[PDB]
Amino acid sequence: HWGYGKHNGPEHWHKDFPIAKGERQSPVDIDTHTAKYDPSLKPLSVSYDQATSLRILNNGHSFQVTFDDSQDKAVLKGGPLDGTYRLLQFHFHWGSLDGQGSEHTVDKKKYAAELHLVHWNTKYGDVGKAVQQPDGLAVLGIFLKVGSAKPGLQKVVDVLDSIKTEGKSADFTNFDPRGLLPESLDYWTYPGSLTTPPLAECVTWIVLKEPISVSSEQVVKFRKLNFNGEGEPEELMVDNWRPAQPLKNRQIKASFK
Ligand SMILES: Cc1cccc(-c2nn3c(c2-c2ccnc(Nc4ccc(S(N)(=O)=O)cc4)c2)CC(C)(C)C3)n1
Ligand SMILES: [Zn+2]
Numbered sequence: 001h002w003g004y005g006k007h008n009g010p011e012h013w014h015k016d017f018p019i020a021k022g023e024r025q026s027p028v029d030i031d032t033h034t035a036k037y038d039p040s041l042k043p044l045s046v047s048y049d050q051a052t053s054l055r056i057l058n059n060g061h062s063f064q065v066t067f068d069d070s071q072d073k074a075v076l077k078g079g080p081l082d083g084t085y086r087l088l089q090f091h092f093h094w095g096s097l098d099g100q101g102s103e104h105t106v107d108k109k110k111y112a113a114e115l116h117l118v119h120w121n122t123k124y125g126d127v128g129k130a131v132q133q134p135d136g137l138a139v140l141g142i143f144l145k146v147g148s149a150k151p152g153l154q155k156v157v158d159v160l161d162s163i164k165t166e167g168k169s170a171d172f173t174n175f176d177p178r179g180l181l182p183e184s185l186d187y188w189t190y191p192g193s194l195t196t197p198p199l200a201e202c203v204t205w206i207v208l209k210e211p212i213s214v215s216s217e218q219v220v221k222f223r224k225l226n227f228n229g230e231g232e233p234e235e236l237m238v239d240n241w242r243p244a245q246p247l248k249n250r251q252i253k254a255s256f257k
Helices: 151-157 216-222
Strands: 044-047 053-058 063-067 075-078 085-094 113-121 137-146 169-171 187-192 203-208 212-214
Touching: 075 113, 085 137, 085 216, 137 216, 151 216
Parallel strands: 137 203, 137 212
Antiparallel strands: 044 075, 053 063, 053 169, 063 085, 075 085, 085 113, 113 137, 187 203
8 A cells, every 4th residue: 555656655654654753763864974983883794605595576665585584694793783683685775767766865865776684683583573672673774876787786687577566576596695785884873763664663774885886777677677566557666765754863873983
């Protein structure tokens, strides 16, 4: 029922999900001059060497690559986090043109897209339980700008024609998400929420400063996806991003000087 258009988009979500107007909603604008360096923050530990990807799928709001999270394989630790967070899935948000598509913004700058690597805190045992906790999930956010191709993304781009419509999925084994990471792990961090329903306030956000570059041909392939299922009127899956929400009583901390 919810989506991104005029009659069911982000400004409507609060009716079904009143937490949409809550105290720690995401995304936010990152004001780089106000974010303070926090020398107590650790380097992030992104340990993806043993990741086991399973499927790629169109869920009618994005496309997502899913991982086996039944043991500590691909894990995020350190940074602002206490304990161990297992990688469950990644997905993207993107625009209809290169000047929009990201959910977080940086001094009001919108990037062409944003990658979300979604991890959950193993102390809660399963992801369903984790989403009910204020420290249940950690989402690693990575901006995409349009320039040179990202070789590590091409394997994803090349299967999107097989999952054009909502409900479609495909085998997507042996995908290495290390190929989506920028050089620097410099980051901003703040407490927030899921950016799609149910908008649960369960996320420690870790947003990398350095964007990755993707080619115009790569992002064009994202824009050929459909929100609709096969047999319904074709409506391009574009502009599947929630706008920046009020920061309220939160501080965004920088890992870097
Ligand atoms: C895959 C899986 C396995 C087992 C349980 C669940 C699950 N169940 N339920 C939920 C979830 C659930 C779990 C994990 N992530 C989400 N959603 C999610 C994740 C990341 C982002 S983003 N854009 O900020 O990165 C936005 C939404 C939802 C939500 C619910 C409480 C209504 C019920 N999901
Ligand atoms: Zn997301």
